[PDB]
């Protein structure tokens, strides 16, 4: 049966609740980590929160205009009227997305705000037969839908290499300086549990909201196709993950086009 080992792994820190069920074995709700809904630091990082340093729009409209500055910074605004990505959005080379911010003259509900509006999808954490823990959806999710964000603990490239647990890191490659990481091993939200699949229904997009300090993008997962209810969430981890972890185990993603089996 479907044993509800938790009603909300997030303890009410998310807009909708995220339950954990287990219908394959004894393992209880996972608790070897601290759930956080936003990113934190352990070592101080000189993030540029200086308000006068923000690019911002002055739209007298809802930032549908061809004149929205923040849309220009994303090349265009890629959000449709109900905050889904356009079909012309390039899932293969996702652009940088700059959402409107508190410096903009626009209203909190202008069109260029999506990631920042919190989690909007009913998902759930559950036990899988082949990969341990996994995250799956309980509703249909259209394509181009902001599913969730990869939240974790901001650490330097350096500190990244010295940690004995590389199973939860996410590379945040600023080209134009130091490269940073999100380690979601000790602190993290639900995305720490999302598994790798070679035909991924999810794609990470680099997104800027309350600050535009390029060293620290935030990582947003949008759906690449329709996700039917019950479907497990998955995204491509990349080659550097498999160059390394592959030497120790293979990809039980189960796809016919599976590239790491």
């Amino acid at each position: 049966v479907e044993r509800i080992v938790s009603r909300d792994i997030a303890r009410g820190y998310e807009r909708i609740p995220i339950p954990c069920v287990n219908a394959v074995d004894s393992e209880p709700c996972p608790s070897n980590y601290k759930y956080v809904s936003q990113n934190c630091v352990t070592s101080p990082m000189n993030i540029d929160r200086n308000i006068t340093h923000l690019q911002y729009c002055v739209c007298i409209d809802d930032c549908s205009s061809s004149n929205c500055m923040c849309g220009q910074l994303s090349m265009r605004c890629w959000y449709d009227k109900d905050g889904r990505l356009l079909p012309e959005f390039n899932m293969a080379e996702p652009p940088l997305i700059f959402e409107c911010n508190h410096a903009c003259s626009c209203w909190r509900n202008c069109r260029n705000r999506v990631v920042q509006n919190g989690l909007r999808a009913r998902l759930q954490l559950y036990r899988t037969r082949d990969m341990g823990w996994g995250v799956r959806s309980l509703q249909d999710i259209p394509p181009g839908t902001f599913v969730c964000e990869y939240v974790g603990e901001l650490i330097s490239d350096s500190e990244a290499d010295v940690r004995e647990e590389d199973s939860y890191l996410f590379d945040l490659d600023n080209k134009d300086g130091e490269v940073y990481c999100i380690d979601a091993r000790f602190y993290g939200n639900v995305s720490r549990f999302i598994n790798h699949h070679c035909e991924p229904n999810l794609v990470p997009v680099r997104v800027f909201m309350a600050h535009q300090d390029l060293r620290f993008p935030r990582i947003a997962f949008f759906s690449t196709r329709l996700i039917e209810a019950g479907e497990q969430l998955g995204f491509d981890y990349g080659e550097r993950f498999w160059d390394i972890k592959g030497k120790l185990f293979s990809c039980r993603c189960g796809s016919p086009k599976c590239r790491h089996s």
């Binding site: 990244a160 590389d166 996410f170 590379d171 990470p204 981890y237 990349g238 550097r240 993950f241 390394i244």
Partner: peptide, 5 residues
């Protein structure tokens, strides 16, 4: 070390 991207 193994990084997701």
């Amino acid at each position: 070390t193994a990084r997701k991207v």
